[PDB]
Paper text:
Here, we present the crystal structure of C. acetobutylicum thiolase (CaTHL), a type II biosynthetic thiolase that catalyses the first step of n-butanol biosynthesis and condenses two acetyl-CoAs to acetoacetyl-CoA. We reveal that CaTHL, unlike other type II biosynthetic thiolases from aerobic bacteria, is regulated via modulation of a redox-switch, indicating that n-butanol production and the relevant metabolic fluxes in Clostridium are tightly regulated by thiolase. CaTHL consists of three domains: an N-terminal α/β domain (N-domain, residues 1–119 and 249–269), a loop domain (L-domain, residues 120–248), and a C-terminal α/β domain (C-domain, residues 270–392). The N- and C-domains form a typical five-layered fold (α–β–α–β–α) observed in other thiolase superfamily of proteins including peroxisomal degradative thiolase from Saccharomyces cerevisiae, β-ketoacyl synthase II from E. coli, and the biosynthetic thiolase from Zoogloea ramigera (ZrTHL)14151617181920.
For comparison, the crystal structure of EcTHL was also determined at 2.10 Å resolution. As hypothesized, there was no disulfide bond formation observed between the two catalytic cysteine residues, Cys89 and Cys379, under oxidized condition. In addition to the absence of a disulfide bond, the catalytic cysteine loop and the flexible region had similar conformations to those of the reduced form of CaTHL, confirming that EcTHL is also non-redox-switch regulated. The flexible regions of EcTHL and ZrTHL are well stabilized by direct and water-mediated hydrogen bond network; on the other hand, in CaTHL, strong hydrogen bond interactions are not observed between the flexible region and its surrounding region. Considering that the flexible region of CaTHL undergoes an order-to-disorder conformational change depending on the disulfide bond formation, it seems that the stability of the flexible region of CaTHL is not sufficiently high, leading to disulfide bond formation under oxidized condition. This would confer the redox-switch regulatory mechanism to the enzyme; on the other hand, the highly stabilized flexible regions of EcTHL and ZrTHL disable the rotation of the Cys378 residue and hence prevent disulfide bond formation. On the other hand, ZrTHL and EcTHL seem to be permanently inactivated upon the oxidation of the corresponding catalytic cysteine residues to sulfinic or sulfonic acid, and cannot be switched back to the active enzymes under reducing condition.
Numbering used by the authors:
A (entry chain B), B (entry chain A), C (entry chain C), D (entry chain D): -2 to 393
């Protein structure tokens, strides 16, 4: 039988993250993906004719046309002979795409892949029912927000992700005040990272050209400057009248992309490129949809166990902040050393472009590891529908 | 470094394929997908607790809710700890899912996976523009058919897959007469198969209940009974008033699903199960979007090479019949022996539910191989956006 | 001061009435209008250049373009110098248009007017909310059935005209049996009148060209052949599950038009044309929206008073059958002699194209009066929003 | 045979005119209508129980519900026994409504009517095709802006009212510079009228109540303070690149209502109320659709002949400024003394809520006549689809 191969990250880049109807609200998911795919390739210094595949996560595919991943790879300038496909694992899509690239490389089926995710929630459409096709006939119908139907509502329970967060908050006893405390801490870490230029290396600018003008978008815009504990404690519950989750202790609706060049190790070295990290393990884990926020627990355990590691071995962790409730409960459950976690801020401040986040956090992890000279890293996140995904990387 | 593993198919099953607004038009893609997932598991006789993952292709995801593959798996009865995700490689999606399943198994990542695809084109929705979200403000807008926008129009050139078929007809000299003759051949072989019970083993019945009456769908309904050369000869071109492509020499818009249980070889034997074929290789290839019908050429060339085989080594072949124009160009380019191709009929008679067709043709191939006691088989198909995928299987 | 003039009907024509999605479902309200306008002019023998105005009732104006009455007159072949406007008094609109034409002639403001009404309920559109113009932003919306929103739901209470009919049933002790008995009688009279050629004189045929083919629509299609007291008594209530109103004891949703030439008496004589009747009086009356079915009471009372008449002086009556419940309550309230009412059947059998019905009953009244050589006629109907209108005509 | 009666205006009121998406954008046309109906009755000091009818113009009736005039009337607090109906003569609706009230009163069918118009263009909906009712089936559709379909595009020619304006400019040689000079002059006269309080008497405040804001709207907000020749001359043409017509020399899309109490003269005196003016005559005229802007020519000539007057007899004139090109063509053709026309500014400055404008200009004329102590007044305006309407009043 063949022998498994080692797989390395050779570059990692992301766009800044746009606010809902903000700076990226006229730049399609596919143009955001093309942008990062191109920049990833440039930064890796790889010969672009040697890219075997592109794998991109994208959750709100409605109306974006055939195979958005292929559209993005073509717009990036890659050759027509470079194949690609679009991954939908909801919030995990962007990391799952990276895991699939690693898997294909490790299994000898390719040598170089560009993998990540992309999402423009601002541009998500509205949907008419199949009933529109066959005819309404008589009586009113419904117009469906696609963000909600395909991206933020649980298809098992018909209620918002928010409510799964509340469920996790009751089950693990995570209080309103614990959530807001975390939220402020994420905002402060983000604000220092942004100010001190910690994200400069990882961000590729996007040129936004409009009828009125052209401008360059290169700074995360979702952070809420000058956030305070009292402002946060003043907010009303978003999803439950008697609830704990608010707009201030939850991530948002956001736009952005991220991509990495993944390569077989001995081929990266023979081509005279510089490996930035090895992909050591990855795993997916499943939980009840009602408690989807806990997905990272089984995923993280499997990934650790597949790497031959203990959690305490890990130097830096990016655990996604879709809701402070789920992020705290996961952290409580596994016993995270929280000073190793989301050291430059997390999604409550930075935003959550769902199909891109999984890859975005991996980008942020690797650059934080390089800046602080750390060796071992963990990226994980919860996934709508009751799943989680995790990946461990080791710096070179 | 780990040793790679062998992957085997342990069951293979499909629904009968529904005509547009036909027998399956009220059964959701997700329910079709659950039916085949459950049936594949039952037929395999595998303990359902041993399923590691479910991978399903699905192209018109718009409005189907979070992660359709995960919904299907939960509906099929699998536990909530079973992970899954949804693949979009357009027409290729369903075979790509099986290829990914086999890769995970080969790589030691999983031991048992259900993979395939599912599509209900009848139930595809209509889409309002992003403008609807931000506001039309003044002036009209458009309401978009999702079938066309995400499934049948080229996102590169903005025209129908029918036009790519016309481009391929010119390039390779495939005339209307040539196209019509293949169409009749296909209708004929499909009718003989139906008549002889050749599809009985592979089809899982779907119960369709409506208040007026409840009925069992178990027979492909797209085939045109009593098709003739004369009748085909009289149709008007569908896409190009001076063209060669018609509704009679192209597949249709259809509903259906297919799935297979795939396992690590030794896990199959340890569970006392009966391997039906080994997956020998698989590959993807890219061609210009304008000539997407030619996708099978580079995919087949790569997959034969990976398998260490020549085209002449293959005993039976399933090459999808999206359009006779591209089916014929492909067979001419590669030198297929046409008596080994689509022996029970192809998509011009059977139908093309896009997300599913790739797994559908593989199911059909395996059963055909079993019926004829053949050893080596190839499944391949073109993909909108200019791709191709192929897989070689070897009977056991 | 000038003195009031006398006004006479010179012609009276209607289309046959179409069922919902029936024979007239692809002929625009405006084309129906033009047909009857043109025909009324031909049958009156008036010089087309002498038409001073066209007044047409039309309730579902949405999407029909500027001033439907004006579009209809232009299509009819009248000169661009002939003015026109569109009236909306809901169910009254068609009779209101005639009353206005008569008032204008009586007041010396014009000599010849064509008036009536037109509706194509089958072609009525659906509406997105103003929120579409501003933008949905986030969250679901509705898509509104214009028939219901602008035609059939009470704008004061938000419930169906249906419910106003249940209200009246109660207020006046009108049982399900009494309603179904009336319904059966209407169906018999109408089938009898159609069989016997009673509508031949008043109906102008419509040429309906479909993509495939052409036919002539000239016979009322809503009547229900072989209606029986038992089938009717078997029906489920349509609007309240403890209710009395059914699809069998109410009119339907329908397509059609009607028009009449009205002239100043002395100018009709000077042109050598034959007055068919004199418009003796007209009136409108108001009642609670909840009891809109009773509108005919004050309208009829006032109209008789303005005509110097008592109910008993009237030889023939057309009292619209929107709902048997209100038609019976009106009849009981006023003491109708039922043998004189709706002698050729009413709307329960014939249909209710709401904009046209007011003119349609008047057309049917005049022709019945001619065939039975009667002298005094009354036409009245109820109007959604709590109104009624009535007109008294005197044959000559 | 009775004798014709005299009709007087007893009150005249309007809302301030809102800009598109401006201060009135959240207030329904019906509410605007109710507001002016109530205020008119209050100003007249009439006993509300003496009101026989309400007749209101309204052009974009789509989705507004049954019989908007009836709704407004009920909303105003009038008794349910008061009938009303809604008029559509496009831009002319509001003045047509007053003419119809006058006609009814002259002809002795009523003694007190409230008449006017109402429009909220900001809240006009979007519409799906009849195809939505029967089903799109396959292929795209359109979503239609009601403002355009029912209110601003020619139903005969399918192009914007602005194009009819270009037709008129070319026909009558009305240059860009002539049009821009008129626009400036109307802006100045409006600014001067606002500065000196000339609108205070005629305007009734509307209370606008939003969660976001609460405030009283009482001042016209479409006029452009500090308009200049140079700014007007720099604007691009709006409807045609070689065109003359711009946003600066055409009226806007606007929201407003206006209404007047009308009464039989002797009943007025008997009631101890003060007649403000006598309605002396009214007429409608027709012209080709393509040249709709010229409609006021035949309407005015008939109105004058019917009143026994020469143009020069008229002391003050309100000729609607839908487009500068049409307004000037009209004045050239009739030889208007411009010093007497639109003395407080016209629609280029004040706006054009289409169903209300015909009433609005009448209210404006009356009050200006009072301020300047003038005796004869003329109100006229052009109408989409190729009509005009005019009215002559005589101050008392």
């Amino acid at each position: 039988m063949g022998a498994m191969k080692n797989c390395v990250i050779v570059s990692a880049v992301r766009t800044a993250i746009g606010s809902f109807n903000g700076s990226l609200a006229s730049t399609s998911a596919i143009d955001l993906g093309a942008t990062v795919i191109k920049a990833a390739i440039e930064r890796a210094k790889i010969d672009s004719q040697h890219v075997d595949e592109v794998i991109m996560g994208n959750v709100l595919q409605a109306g974006l046309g055939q195979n958005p991943a292929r559209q993005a790879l073509l717009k990036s300038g890659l050759a027509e002979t470079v194949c690609g496909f679009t991954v939908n694992k909801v919030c995990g899509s962007g990391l799952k795409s990276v895991a699939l690239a690693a898997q294909a490389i490790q299994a000898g089926q390719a040598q170089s892949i560009v993998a990540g995710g992309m999402e423009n929630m601002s541009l998500a459409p509205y949907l008419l029912d199949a009933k529109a096709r066959s005819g309404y006939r008589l009586g009113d119908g419904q117009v469906y927000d696609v963000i909600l139907r395909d991206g933020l509502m649980c298809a098992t329970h018909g209620y918002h992700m928010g409510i799964t967060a509340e469920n996790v908050a009751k089950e693990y006893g995570i209080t309103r005040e614990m959530q807001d405390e975390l939220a402020l801490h994420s905002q402060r870490k983000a604000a220092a990272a942004i100010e001190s230029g910690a994200f400069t290396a990882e961000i590729v600018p996007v040129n936004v050209v409009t009828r009125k003008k052209t401008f360059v978008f290169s700074q995360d815009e979702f952070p809420k400057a000058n956030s305070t504990a009292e402002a946060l404690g003043a907010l009303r519950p978003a999803f439950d009248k008697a609830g704990t989750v608010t707009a201030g202790n939850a991530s948002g609706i956001n736009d952005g992309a991220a991509a990495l060049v993944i390569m077989e190790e001995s081929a990266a070295l023979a081509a005279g490129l510089t490996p930035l990290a090895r992909i050591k393990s990855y795993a997916s884990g499943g939980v009840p949809p009602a408690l989807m926020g806990m997905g990272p627990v089984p995923a993280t355990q499997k990934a650790l166990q597949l790497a031959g590691l203990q959690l305490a071995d890990i130097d830096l962790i990016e655990a996604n902040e879709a809701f402070a409730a789920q992020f705290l409960a996961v952290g409580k459950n596994l016993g995270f050393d929280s000073e190793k976690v989301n050291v430059n801020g997390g999604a409550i401040a930075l935003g959550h472009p769902i199909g891109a986040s999984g890859a975005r956090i991996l980008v942020t992890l690797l650059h934080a590891m390089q800046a602080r000279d750390k060796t071992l890293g963990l990226a994980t996140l919860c996934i709508g529908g009751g799943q989680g995904i995790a990946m461990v990387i080791e710096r070179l």
